[PDB]
Every structure is written in C-alpha cells, then in structure tokens.
Amino acid sequence: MTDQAFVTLTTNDAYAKGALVLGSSLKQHRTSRRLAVLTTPQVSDTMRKALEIVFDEVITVDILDSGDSAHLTLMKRPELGVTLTKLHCWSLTQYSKCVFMDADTLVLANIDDLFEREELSAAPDPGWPDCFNSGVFVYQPSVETYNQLLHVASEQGSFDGGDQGLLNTFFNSWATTDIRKHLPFIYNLSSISIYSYLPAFKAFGANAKVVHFLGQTKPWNYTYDTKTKSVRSEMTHPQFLNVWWDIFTTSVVPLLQQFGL
C-alpha cells in the first residue's frame, strides 16, 4: 500500500538515531507500507542523508519560519514547539492512513495490522489509563483536522505541556467509546511498566510488538558493549535496549559511515 505509511519525527541528531533504528526495525519486520519522517533544519545534513536511505520520504518542517502554518501558534505558546511540529503529520495528505510512532519507539514484530484501525486509535497510557499514550497512533491525514488541532493548541494549549495532552483533549471520546480504538498495550509497551507492574510484564510482556522508551535516559544515552552485546548497567529491561543497540550497531552505524567517502 503506497497510500499508507508509518510516520515519525526527529527535531535533532539524537532523535535522528532513534528514527533510523525505528525505520530499520520496520524494514526488518517487512512492512508493506511506506516509511516517512518529519525533520527540522536542526537535523544535520549527514543525519538527513541517512534518513533519506532508510525512509521512503523525508519531509522538512520549520515552524521557526513565518511561512509555516503553525508559526503563529508557536509564538503564542513557544513551549509547544515539538508538539506543533508533530501535528504536521496530519498535513501528509499524500497518505490516506498512517501510524505515527515517536522516534523513541522500537518495532519488535510486523504491525501492519494497525492499518485496519480508524482514527484515532491508540494504546492506554500507564499512569492515567483514561488518556491514550501519543507515542503510537493510527490517524488519517487531513488539512481540516490539522487546522482544528492548531486551533485547540492556540486556544487551550496542552494540559501536560506536550503533544499527548493536546491530542487527548481533541480526541476526547477515546476512553469511553469504541474498544477497537484502544490499541493493545503491546503495540506501545511503556519501558516504565517493566517495573511498575513486573508480574504483568512477566505474564504478557513476551508478546510485545512495540517498545516505547520513556524516561530521561533514552536508548542512545546508554553504553553498549559490542562484545557481550549488552548495555552497561552503569533490570528485566535490558532485553529491549539490547535489541535497539543491535540494530543501531548492525545497520545504522555502518550506514552513517558510508558518508565519510
């Protein structure tokens, strides 16, 4: 399906690493859909060039420019920069349906069956289960919806200062309507939950399809030993970090190196 795609975002080089790993993981699990990534001018040329190889489409978004539709809203609420940039995922009208995934997520299995879902489908957020986690969600690109979201960001802002607060406010019937719009937790497994409720992780964690690396320390912030093939504890959670690093080590770094020549 050329009209459907997975979409991610990177506003700097650190998250670009995440996006490259994410995109590679989707290729690894043979998705039949297109891969697109939103990028900002702050992403270095070498990183953008790597993204052009992994992703089918690289879209540049610069909300800092007066010409951008979200710029005016940005001036009003500057703390929503990342959010407003992410909302541009709805401007990708070349696609009929997409699955947005933050650059700090990792695909562990084919999840093309997510395209059978309707907007707005997302997994429950741990912490406050009646809000969905915005790390992974099925949506339909639309200039109308995009403009509607910008209007809410402008008028109300976000209750949590992030894109998750804004998205939950706009798509507020999620908790009480249509069980099909509740994506199983394994489609966006919070790396945090592998502690808050370990018994449940032990019981159902083996079915994880997507891992969402939350917390201050992102995957790229860890130290990885290529010999033992494991991150340094310097947790029941290393298993996922090691997958991320194996892909980074095996496919992403070799790729970034071919640019030196």
Place this chain on the structure above:
Amino acid sequence: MTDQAFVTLTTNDAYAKGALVLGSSLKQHRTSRRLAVLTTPQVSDTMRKALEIVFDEVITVDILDSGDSAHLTLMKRPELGVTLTKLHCWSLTQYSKCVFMDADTLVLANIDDLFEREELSAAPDPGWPDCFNSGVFVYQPSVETYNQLLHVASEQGSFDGGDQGLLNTFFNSWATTDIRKHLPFIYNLSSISIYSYLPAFKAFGANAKVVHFLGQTKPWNYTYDTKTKSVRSEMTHPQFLNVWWDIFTTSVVPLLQQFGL
C-alpha cells in the same frame, strides 16, 4: 434495590477501619443499595459489632476451616488466602448484582450508576492498562462462577500472587471487548497516579468519585491532626487522606466508643 449491594472485605482489624470508613462514605453519598461486608474470625468482636451497625449484612468467612469450599484450594496455594476469601463475594446469591470495593477505597460521590453495568466491569489498572484493577468491580453473584474461579485458582493460581491476577485471567476479554466494561478511571482512582501523571490528575482529578489507597502506607497508618484537620507529612494527595480521616474521626471512632458502655 434490596437485591443489589456494595460488597467489601476485611480480614483483620486494620482493614476493618477501612471498611467502616468506606461503608460510612457510601451512606454519606446516599446509596439506595444494601451494604455487605465479608469478615473473617480474625476480626475482633468490637470491630465486628461496629460493622454490624454500618453494614446491612456481615458475612463470616473462614477458609481456615475444612468446611469452607475454598479450604482445599487454600492448602494447595496458601499464599492465595486473601484472594480465596474475596472470591466468596460471588457466593452472595441473595444479591442479583453487586459492586465489590476493597476496604482501602473511599467513595467521594454517589456511584449507584455502576449498577447499570454488567459483569465484569472494572477500571483500568495503571502500570499495565490492559489489566483491570480489582479494587472496584461490578459482578453477578453465582455459585457456578464462584466454583469456576476456584478451579482456575487451583489449576493456574495467580500471575501476580493476588486476586487481581486471578480475576484478570478468568475475565480475560476485558481489554479487547465492550468499552462499557471499562469503568472510568475516576471510579477507582489510584492514589499512586497522583504523581505518576500529575498533569492528568490536575486536569481530570477533580471529578474523582472513588479513591483507591494503594502503596504500603494505608490511610490508617498516617497521623492526623484533628485541629488543623490534616494528616502529617511525617503531596497533592493529602486532600483524599484528609477526607478519609475526617469520616473516621467524625463517624467511625465515635461509633466504636459506644461499645465501652
């Protein structure tokens, strides 16, 4: 409705305090249903007598006795004692539909509308959102269901060592079926979530109808100043603890005192 009731449980005197506060809170918010409480022989006579005043019905359960239906299962899995005692809520066939509530919960508003729900309806558990939290749930008493649950406890036990693991295993279609069986999080608000996702609590916490005191330190473990009417920090969470203590101070203690004469 004399055929419907709220049901709780207390296996000792500490939780009996919780049950008395819970029952009082339900009376405070004028429930039209009956109030029932499961008790064990370990609850002192004075506490049982207090329970007989607050609750419409006090049922004694002693799984330690060979005559109890759950005894055999208890010998097999002794760590499930509390769970097996709680399962006896399904033996209350004098009721057609009930809302079970753990003794460490607190009602903040009338929640009689829960009786419009079907078994098994429960709110999402923070931590692992695809499991429901067993602190509050709508069920239908039935010897058949009770026996079926005992069979699962005997054969598989509980993945989390508690009643929540067992209930989720038996009522396993909850996460993927019928959005109406997902009780809003405000019907069983985890006291923990008032930190894990404070922004969400600030945004929707004001609508809390039931608070579930989780964590090692229960409400009765805190020190309460009757003058300032607030617990001692010795948190955005005190508001709920103070309600609990106000009811305990105002209605429960005065009640327990009338037994000295």
